Amino acid sequence: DPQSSTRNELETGSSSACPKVIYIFARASTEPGNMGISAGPIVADALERIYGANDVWVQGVGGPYLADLASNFLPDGTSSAAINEARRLFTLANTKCPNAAIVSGGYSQGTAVMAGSISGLSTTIKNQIKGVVLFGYTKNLQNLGRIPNFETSKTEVYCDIADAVCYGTLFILPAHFLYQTDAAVAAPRFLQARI
Q: What induces the gene encoding this protein?
């Protein structure tokens, strides 16, 4: 499969051609584009082959989400700027396509983007988000395995045991990508079952 680290299908999408699924993703620290090159596109590919590329809009959280190392250490685990950009994309999804199933994901830092943005969204927009997958959730223990104010039923955390940040340890840049299987198999099935 082509690997596209920049996906802007919500941004450029027409409210005259709303898809069945809108898939929004926040990448890990240091990853290129707005999708990164690991869990982001793996999930993108996996969903597009469940429903067809035409019936899924794939959107990265780019712009002011720079995915830098320093932001992991801030109280929220990422920047306010990144959180606000993700809020803006969720709102744009609801605005453009209120009847579409929103699903989203985050890997490492991108999970903090997801937690911080989604926790602040309206009842209406949250209800539109059918499922959220959090690979290497860096605030896992701190946030009690959930996104605040977002249904735990619609939320899945993926942690590998070699991932100490999932389990309270202060942030370290992951030396290895640990979520190939979770991203390829478990996550797209969890999302599909909520669409």
A: By contact with cutin.
